C-alpha cells in the first residue's frame, strides 16, 4: 500500500526525468530517494513474511508432534 | 525469473554507466527505470507470498480446529 | 542484515549526493550500484521465502492427508 504509493511516486518522477532529459540532476537524486524508500518499505514487509513463515513452522510442528504423541 | 532478467539488464546498464563515467545522463535515467521495474516485479512476488502465507494460516487453523473438535 | 547493511550504505550515499547537489555524477552512479545490490539481496531472501512457503505447503498437505487417511 505504502509500497504501492512509493512506486507510483517513483513512476511519476521517472516520467518527469525522461521528459526533462527530453534541474535533471536534482530529479535524478530525488528519484534515487524514491527508490531507496521503496526498497526499505519492501524490506519491512519482507521481514514480516519471514517472521510469519517462522510462526507457521512452529504451528505445523506443534500439530505434527501432537499427532506423533497421540500414537 | 523476470526479476532475474530485470536484474541482469540492470547489471548490464550499471557496467555501461561505470565505463561511460570512465550520454551518461540518459543511461543513468534508463538505469533508474531498470531498478523501478525490478522493485515492481519484486513487489508482485512479495504480494503473492503474503497471500500464500494467509492461505497457509487458514489451512493450519482448519487442522487445529479439526483436532480440537475431535476431542 | 546484509540488506540492512546495504540500505544504510545507500542511505549514506543518498545524503552525500543531496549535500553535493547542494563528482556528483560518480556518486549517483555508485548510489545506483548500492540500490542494485540491495534489490539483489532482497531477491535472494524473497527466493528463500518462496521455497519456505512451498515446504510448509507440503507439510500441511501431509498432515491433511494423514487425517483423511485415518478416517
From Swiss-Prot, chains A, B, C:
Subunit notes for this chain? The mature envelope protein (Env) consists of a homotrimer of non-covalently associated gp120-gp41 heterodimers. The resulting complex protrudes from the virus surface as a spike. There seems to be as few as 10 spikes on the average virion.
The protein here is known as Transmembrane protein gp41
Source organism of this protein record: Human immunodeficiency virus type 1 group M subtype B (isolate HXB2)
Which parts of the sequence are annotated with region: Immunosuppression?
54-71
Per the record, membrane topology reads: Single-pass type I membrane protein
**Biological role stated in the UniProt entry:** Acts as a class I viral fusion protein. Under the current model, the protein has at least 3 conformational states: pre-fusion native state, pre-hairpin intermediate state, and post-fusion hairpin state. During fusion of viral and target intracellular membranes, the coiled coil regions (heptad repeats) assume a trimer-of-hairpins structure, positioning the fusion peptide in close proximity to the C-terminal region of the ectodomain. The formation of this structure appears to drive apposition and subsequent fusion of viral and target cell membranes.
Compartment(s) of residence: Virion membrane; Host cell membrane; Host endosome membrane
Amino acid at each position: 500500500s505504502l509500497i504501492e504509493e512509493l512506486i507510483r511516486r517513483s513512476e511519476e518522477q521517472q516520467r518527469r526525468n525522461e521528459e526533462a532529459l527530453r534541474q535533471l540532476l536534482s530529479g535524478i537524486v530525488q528519484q534515487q530517494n524514491n527508490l531507496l524508500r521503496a526498497i526499505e518499505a519492501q524490506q519491512h514487509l519482507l521481514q514480516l513474511t519471514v517472521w510469519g513463515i517462522k510462526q507457521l513452522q512452529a504451528r505445523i510442528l506443534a500439530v505434527e508432534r501432537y499427532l506423533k504423541d497421540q500414537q
